[PDB]
Symmetry: C2
Subunit: 92 residues, 2 copies
């Protein structure tokens, strides 16, 4: 529990991690821009720190999609947590 996951904001987690699980269940590889758009985080919050914190925390990894276009892939830990956060969303 030094997990940097603990340092993340609940809203950012409950937004981004379920969004990426739902794209994955559909077979779709979304761009950083589509991830922001579907999740509802601000692009300024995303590109000015959040993305790199999710990477640091072992929750996602960034990959090249095509020229000039990157995606995030869930790690097994990020996917395990994403599923737990889906139920949190129901409650809320």
């Amino acid at each position: 529990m030094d997990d940097e996951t603990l340092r993340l904001q609940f809203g950012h987690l409950i937004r981004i991690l379920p969004t990426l699980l739902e794209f994955e269940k559909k077979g779709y590889e979304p761009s950083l821009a589509e991830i922001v758009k579907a999740s509802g985080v601000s692009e300024k919050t995303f590109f000015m720190g959040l993305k790199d914190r999710l990477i640091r925390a072992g929750l996602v990894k960034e990959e090249t999609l095509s020229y000039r276009v990157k995606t995030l892939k869930l790690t097994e830990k990020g996917r395990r947590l994403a599923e737990c956060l889906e139920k949190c969303r129901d409650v809320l």
Copy 2:
């Protein structure tokens, strides 16, 4: 919601701790909540307690002339159950 503005670590420590006391029928003082949860006294007393109250996740009550406690609301209770499962992923 104010719930979304909370830090995941503080949530994952406090609300599960309270739920586990409640299942055992135990009514902890504020100091016992701090110690069992692993948050510091300063973190708890300098904003976190009151953030959890403002998010509707807990209610503060005077338990006796001696001590206070926090009770889970039903929202707080449902979210605690989900955060336990989250804790099985981390550990």
